[PDB]
Amino acid sequence: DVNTLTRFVMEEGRKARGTGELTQLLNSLCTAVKAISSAVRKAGIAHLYGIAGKLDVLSNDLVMNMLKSSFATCVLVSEEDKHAIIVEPEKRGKYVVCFDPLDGSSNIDCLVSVGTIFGIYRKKSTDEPSEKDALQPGRNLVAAGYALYGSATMLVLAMDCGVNCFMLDPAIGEFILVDKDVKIKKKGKIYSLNEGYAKDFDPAVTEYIQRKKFPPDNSAPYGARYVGSMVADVHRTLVYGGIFLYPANKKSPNGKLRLLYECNPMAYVMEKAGGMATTGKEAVLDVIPTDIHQRAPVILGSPDDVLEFLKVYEKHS
Amino acid sequence: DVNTLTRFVMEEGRKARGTGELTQLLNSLCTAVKAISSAVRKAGIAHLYGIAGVKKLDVLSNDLVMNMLKSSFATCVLVSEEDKHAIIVEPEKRGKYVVCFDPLDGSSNIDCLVSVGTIFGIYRKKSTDEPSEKDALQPGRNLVAAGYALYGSATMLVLAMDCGVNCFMLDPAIGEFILVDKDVKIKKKGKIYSLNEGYAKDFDPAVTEYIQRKKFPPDNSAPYGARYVGSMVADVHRTLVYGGIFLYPANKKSPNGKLRLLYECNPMAYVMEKAGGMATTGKEAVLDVIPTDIHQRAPVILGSPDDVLEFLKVYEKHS
Amino acid sequence: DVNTLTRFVMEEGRKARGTGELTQLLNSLCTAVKAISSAVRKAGIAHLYGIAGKLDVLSNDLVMNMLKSSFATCVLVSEEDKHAIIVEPEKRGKYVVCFDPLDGSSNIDCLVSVGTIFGIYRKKSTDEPSEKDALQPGRNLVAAGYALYGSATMLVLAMDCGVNCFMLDPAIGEFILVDKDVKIKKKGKIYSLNEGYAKDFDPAVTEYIQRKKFPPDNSAPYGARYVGSMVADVHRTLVYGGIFLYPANKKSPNGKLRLLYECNPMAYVMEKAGGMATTGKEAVLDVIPTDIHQRAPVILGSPDDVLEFLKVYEKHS
Amino acid sequence: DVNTLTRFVMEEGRKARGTGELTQLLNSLCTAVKAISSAVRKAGIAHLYGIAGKLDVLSNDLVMNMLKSSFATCVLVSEEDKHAIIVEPEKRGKYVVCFDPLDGSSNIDCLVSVGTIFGIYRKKSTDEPSEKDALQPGRNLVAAGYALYGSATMLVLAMDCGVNCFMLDPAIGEFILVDKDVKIKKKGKIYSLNEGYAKDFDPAVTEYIQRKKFPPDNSAPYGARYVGSMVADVHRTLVYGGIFLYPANKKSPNGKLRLLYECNPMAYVMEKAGGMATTGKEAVLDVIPTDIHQRAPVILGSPDDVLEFLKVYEKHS
Ligand SMILES: Nc1ccc(S(=O)(=O)NC(=O)NCCSSCCNC(=O)NS(=O)(=O)c2ccc(N)cc2)cc1
């Protein structure tokens, strides 16, 4: 049986006997994603170039507008906005959503894969909504995932029931369920990080990478891949296995990537797929945020690979 | 004034007083690229999944390019990554051009939705003999045209001819390649290096030292950043766009590198050179290598002249 | 605020305190219509003409398959199928769907507008599902409408709340609401029938048409339009006002159009928009079917026009 | 072998050893036709309806700008512009083009099939380019045809070599040759006019239509079809055979349809396909225009059908 994103979610909803609010929310986001995908693949560019005689801002506008009009949200956090957005009282629903509408776009000039990342929370206070409703640990996520605009557009959705991947068929504008209850490999053969920053690495990251290129057990070295776009690298980590690293060094003690709308959703996807995501000190999903725009170290991927990194981290103390 | 690929090539043709053969071939190629782009983006995948109750993409891409080029009436010899032997176009469909192409580069990893691409190099037949595989055995210096299609966040066609390098965005809403960057030139010097460092244990000592210089600059400047998509078209396009260096060098295990000379290395070297960049094997210019086999491998270091010169300084140090 | 067919039907469902079965049915149907649209507009036709070296059957398979897999239906009646299709027990839901998956495909060779027509009923008994579950008068309809594959693809949906029109944006594959709670003009200025068959006309049809062309008063004669594709002619009638006729004559005493999947859904759309739909003798919606493929005469559109037709009809009764 | 519009045209040009200028013109026109098809099918409508928070004018702007930028044209006559457009000297080429950028669009509110009609002449005079250069008889056309935005988008091209039909594959944005050297049927079985004007018909049209409905020879009566959109009506006539009529009437004493960019192109297509196009008095292609927006009555289609009407017209003087 063919299945689609809308139908899949709605059927998980009907089981949980939900009110439809989360289905509405995910439907609207699905809509914004298709619209972002379309702008990203350059439909309409001919008009900009004079046929008849901004992208990350468009992407933010689409997500922001679609989530507000879903009547399922109350607080909206985005990379694009300094403060949390509070949904006008009339359009207010029970969920908080933290998103990065066009992750990777600093390098979209070279047509690198880009993505939208999102994490969904239930609001915490009956008390009127605020930016504080967004300051929750990843452990509280109701759902999370990303759209990848790579060679094709895929939406990866993580929920209680697991992680499921939906391909956008642009002939019909529908997300088709193609990979079910996805689980990451126990151990992969690829590591992924900016090695250009070698000089600044933590000694525990230095020794780990050393172990990948020069294996102490005489096994075959890991390959290295690093697109420089997080959704792309993380997606490859899910599909193929291995490890993705954006770690802390003494110059950036809290990494560079953003906890709420980058590290948490990816860590939640990872955990639902049987993988792991650590900061080094603790699970990313355990960190309790105080700033919506705070940064986090992130090491994620295959369980045996992350545990291997953690054993080195522990050694260096 | 808005410009399209067809209009751009046609106009260059009139300046040169051409018969029209190269324009027809580039039009057919660009029809193929759009059909490839559509299949790569998964148009109609819903039918594979039972929406109403088959070919792999590299096979389909090969069939698309092959069939479109044959039917162009502009070609006589076709060399593809996918076929062990050169295809000799039947007599009724022959033109004067020899095309070397990789129909879907990087597709080995297309399961993770990595950027893929098409690469092509076009030669005029030299000999007056019946066409054969030898007609494809020309150094890169003889290229008439070369370029690539990148199926990335968007689909862009990068074309190199004598007039220089021009970048055409595919507008999927209308199926037209729109000229969006004209006569493109690479940075003199970049800040990104690109290789698979996972195989560092097998590097040539010159590569080890070069990479060491990038990560730990003796002149104490800021290090270079690192990127490696692991898809040649992706990596080479970023190098053109942002500058820096792309390396797939020879080593002890692989003394001729891995990438293919005719339909990966040469087209990309030609594009780099027409954009003011460099491309070397370490010992020679990529475009100067005379092939003896159509599926032969070359080492390739390419990118910003200052960055490639710096690799060559280190290379020379180690002989 | 932007609205889509899914978000819209779902708001209606929450209002009505529904389980969501009908929304699932309508989402599935929507997915089918997008796939028909793409096919009808000839996406991928290059592959049939050898670039790399039937539409009525496909349309039927798209609708049947999406409906079965909706878990919302139990009996499916199609123009294409001799007998009613009974859904497998594990896939059964509460609704009966009567449809014409590609109406007008007889002349698709000339690229005439084509369409999909559907009518949704609730199954009325707890019996084992059979053809008889489809033998309901149009008054029993829960929802009905049509997709028109015209210069654009539009979906017109009638429910208790009235008639709403959704444009398919092919860029993103969403049905966008563009006309809310539509009502037909009280009187139009267009008549629509095949005048080539005038020697077979009912003397009443003869006189009515005569009056439109040669009015007794000083009024301008009506204009004439006849696409010959029902969805196109009925939609122009909804949009512009006027009258559409496929009436009985001596040779065909029950007309040519099919009651369950052509006449009834259009009668329902017409009546929810404040229009009328008669066989000449009674409302189309009141006819009790005894056969799934039985024919009905239909005269429909603006009420002043249909009432005027009935006046002439009675004159000869 | 698969053929495309660009490749077909360019091969015809090489046979005739032409400069390439007519190819440049026709490529530019086809690009415009793809952008019109995309706008007409409502790509991007979601943005109009606020997802991120005029058609005939755009269609005009598309054909104008693309034809100017071809370097192939010197004088442009459009339905949308009161006067001929004189191409600036730097963009001037040898062809004059008369076109209707979106024909039938006054009724597009009901998603009626629309189309683009074009007629291409070589500038005949050696004078400075002026409106006069557009006033040549249709006999002088070098090429003509239409894009029909119907259930699918098809470009129909008439040149010296015959009539060729190319379907737009929207998945790849390419016009594919589907029907080669097209010839109309010698006699058809459908007649096509607005019979709402029956009161204004002169005796010849009246007798002819009466003949179609009540065949003197006891042959089968003709079917009637009238979309009310010329491109749709004419294309069906080309595809199925039969006859299309838009005669003069009280409101339109010189006919309704425009000679330069409606009647001439269609008459040219008809004639290259072995059909016929008449005003009643003379071939449409023989009319020598005096004014760019002037109207002509038109009767066109299958040769035996036009001949039969012409025997009737003769009877009535
Ligand atoms: N029926 C018909 C249609 C069209 C014409 S026409 O007058 O427009 N003539 C043609 O269409 N002639 C054939 C087109 S030839 S295009 C001339 C431009 N030359 C060209 O592209 N040469 S090339 O060898 O392909 C070339 C391309 C690019 C470069 N850089 C160099 C050479 C008449 C009748």
Ligand SMILES: Nc1ccc(S(=O)(=O)NC(=O)NCCSSCCNC(=O)NS(=O)(=O)c2ccc(N)cc2)cc1
């Ligand atoms: N006019 C009309 C239209 C439709 C109906 S109906 O019978 O079909 N009813 C509805 O459409 N009702 C809408 C409310 S039920 S739809 C969703 C089921 N709930 C749900 O998804 N809840 S959830 O909280 O969002 C949820 C989502 C995902 C998970 N995993 C868990 C819960 C009648 C009349």
